[PDB]
Amino acid sequence: RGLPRELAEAVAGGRVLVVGAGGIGCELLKNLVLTGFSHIDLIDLDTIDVSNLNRQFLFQKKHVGRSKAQVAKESVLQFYPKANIVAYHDSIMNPDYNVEFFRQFILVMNALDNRAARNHVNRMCLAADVPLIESGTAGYLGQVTTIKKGVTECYECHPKPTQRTFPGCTIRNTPSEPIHCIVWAKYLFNQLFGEEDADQEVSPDRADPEAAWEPTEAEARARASNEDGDIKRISTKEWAKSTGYDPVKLFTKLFKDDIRYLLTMDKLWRKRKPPVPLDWAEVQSQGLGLKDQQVLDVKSYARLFSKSIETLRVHLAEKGDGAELIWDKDDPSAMDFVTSAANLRMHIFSMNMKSRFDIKSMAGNIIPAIATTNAVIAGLIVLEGLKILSGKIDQCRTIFLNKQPNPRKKLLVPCALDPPNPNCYVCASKPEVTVRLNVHKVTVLTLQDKIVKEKFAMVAPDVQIEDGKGTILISSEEGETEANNHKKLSEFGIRNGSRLQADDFLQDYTLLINILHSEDLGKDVEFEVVG
Amino acid sequence: MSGIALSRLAQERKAWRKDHPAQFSAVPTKNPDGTMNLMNWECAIPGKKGTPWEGGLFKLRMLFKDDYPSSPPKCKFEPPLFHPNVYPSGTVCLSILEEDKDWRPAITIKQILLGIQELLNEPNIQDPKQAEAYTIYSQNRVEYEKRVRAQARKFAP
Amino acid sequence: GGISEEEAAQYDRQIRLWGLEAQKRLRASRVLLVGLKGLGAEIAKNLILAGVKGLTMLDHEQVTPEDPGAQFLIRTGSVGRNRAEASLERAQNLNPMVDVKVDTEDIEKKPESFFTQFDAVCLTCCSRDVIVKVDQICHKNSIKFFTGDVFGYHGYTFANLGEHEFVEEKTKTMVKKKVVFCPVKEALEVDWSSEKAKAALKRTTSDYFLLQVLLKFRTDKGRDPSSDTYEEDSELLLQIRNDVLDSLGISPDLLPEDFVRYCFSEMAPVCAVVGGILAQEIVKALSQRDPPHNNFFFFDGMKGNGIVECLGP
Amino acid sequence: YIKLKVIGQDSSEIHFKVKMTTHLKKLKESYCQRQGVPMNSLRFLFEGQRIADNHTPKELGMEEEDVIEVYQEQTGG
Amino acid sequence: YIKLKVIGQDSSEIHFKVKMTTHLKKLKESYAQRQGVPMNSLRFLFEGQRIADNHTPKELGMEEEDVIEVYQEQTGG
Ligand SMILES: Nc1ncnc2c1ncn2[C@@H]1O[C@H](COP(=O)(O)O)[C@@H](O)[C@H]1O
């Protein structure tokens, strides 16, 4: 081995986990294996897709359908069985990956594409004081970043939001970009095939069979036929389920009637160009590149819409009682549905047609990436990791990757690790204690009084569990949670390695509780704070 | 869910409990297990003195996504009510909680709730987000007033 | 376009970046590769994944026990076997519809006509005279010439495109430009004692100088650095560094004495990164879709930065 | 007004104008608005110096037409 | 104290006098005085940056007599 032995033995004796079996993940794992790392933990929730083969060199064509972690492990046994590899087919947000699950590792690097998972692993590692190496890949772009507790800024020092979801209110009435109608189609799919998420509801709810146009012309009917509430707003999902998802009825409801209903807003179209309603009858009876890169005719899009809704109705019939269908970027039926809807909306608002290829591009927010940049990012990650394990954190630096050399004739740019921001609330040196207790017998009453009120002088405790989603366990106002004070912590899902945040409305000082399960405490006591 | 969002929401809850407008309500929702999730809230907005909506106590749910406070919360009245600026699915829109116009991460729960209150007190025409309420309020004002009174008595405390 | 549906699906990600036409030109492309240090293996893998229809690689050495225990292409315990034949199975497994070729003959003995059927040639772990020969042949044949290597935290690449044409995105929709580059004998043997080169030197990376030291040491010692002979070889690199830089007319202190402790190794990270950038350059040149970087790029791993530079234009 | 140049990580050229006392806050917000990217996703670098939120042109002291580097710490890995 | 330099779409300039740390009162009273039009259907752009309903000049970074221009309403979408 060409590595220095002081570091070679450290990497061959320590344990490092890498999260996400992406192309970056697979290249990272290969680099770690070649470097001499002995124990490596790999976790991924997704399976190998056909389009996934473009970058994941560890995954072959025959490997589609299996878990990413299992296939990555099998591939690394193809050239180095000696490495200790642990594979997990799960998501990081699963609570069993507690602070103790990260504390076991000497180093950890993220290879994720979703911002939420990245923030979660950031928080978990800062809880476990295990150094992190941040990275991301996009096309010919890339970067790496060291994340160290109390030395460098954490990934949450500068809050970076997740993917653009758009307000919804703009797209539901007046789309003006292809992205607008695409997210409109996604929301409509969630509305009439997914769960009853009223936020995703984008098609209007009314007396659906009526072809509404200026109800003020029938003002007496609008209050004599039905009471206040517009016939109690028949749900679009319920209407579609009751009508058996009739392609013609659905098409006219969401492309002719609702368009006129929108056209009732003359105050909106006095500035914006008014859209046009399309009817199924006239569209049907009016009389090279990839297969997805060419725009089709509105009649062909309507035919695709009908076929897609038929297939999706069949798939829903495969489910029970109308179970929701989760959207995906690879399902042919749902994707044909969304492209048809988006192109129909574009033709509605006098906008140009967009091919299925572009809808696939910006619908699932597929970020392009090349194995070149993926490889360089993984190499930067492992170089920074060996620097970290060597203790040369001062020499560790944030490195970006460029498609074109900068005017400073540099392609990989080094930047000093900025000190952590003192007030981002996650990397601050907030006081913490760990208390061992028997989860299955201690109750919320004891937790609130004995463990917090008198043990830490909290006069108004509102302890809160930071499970990665956010919920308060108890409230300072007794009228909010006193009904569940007799429950156990195991009843609320606080397992070993969990942690809670406590606060006071008058002492205005926060305190963090770390949970360790300890049956050995006996009967005389139910808890103990570790000194 | 970002930890910054969690800490910020905890601070907002503390500030709201310490000081909030009279007979207003803003609490995290009762989870099925009995806890409250601070990322999704139940709120109820009372009417203003002399206004047609006076006396009613209109229930409103607001949704916080992982990008808060960079992203605004998505609010929604349950059940949906008869107002031009609310989508009859219940969700409401205003520049206060829309990214591209005025949404500032530094703003708090109290001021956005006051914004929704004054929006209810200010039915606008230049930004219609619904049809039926818009056309009634634009053409036949007396029926709109009668329906507003009916709603106010419908959501009375 | 004669692109099949499943082949497009396997390439679906990169089409969204550089378009169908670049992929079609790659399907019309053939590449010659030489040398299989971790760098050769990674560059072969990345070219395979890129979508070039045919990759031909050449090497003159077997798998030896002194080689590291992992090369991520050759199978476990493939010692004694030819490295090309030890790797071809996994290399083809990386992408089934791309065909690969394995050559055991040394490029020194290889005839000039053998390079004609390739649009790009890649060189690794070879003597500078043979680099000159292959580069001048490539320039004569109007073919794009690339080379590069890795040694510890230090790595380099070179690219000579000759008369080259390419397109770019109009980033303040494609627009056509062109670029011209010079052979290695013009680039590598640049006279630094000239006033303009001397002026540019003070803001010129020393990575080229340590590369020249390494190259010389490779040519005269007949083998690459190996950890079992660190001390005597290290002193040899130091003294030959003095010899070359004072002969070239530059102060040896510009290459600090500790550079040996960094270069005297072969590591996966620095190998993988330089190979990735080399593959980026190769695919940009073959597709003519992105503007190639200038003839030289270097990497200092301990310093954690990469520099593109112009030498001997 | 005193002129400066900002060249993007993707070789995108954008050209902006500023005063010596005008906080770079405005400059970076303007850039991310023009590019349509969330603010915290961009890193601004001058000759290797990270541009802080509390920075002002008389502090880093550039000359006119000087280049200020931007790099975008993108997700999607 | 602050000299206001508000000009509407009709090129109408109205003068006001407010303190340094005015936060919302400035824009609220300017709206209520010049309105002719509902408040929500109007906006002022200040050095090309759209203000918030509490954006004070001291934390904006403007000073006396700085020119502030309104912009066409974006309520239509
Ligand atoms: N929460 C998560 N848990 C495990 N793996 C994940 C998670 N989020 C993303 N990944 C993986 O991270 C990789 C990122 O995508 P890509 O790099 O494009 O392959 C994929 O392999 C995903 O399956």
Ligand SMILES: [Zn+2]
């Ligand atoms: Zn922090």
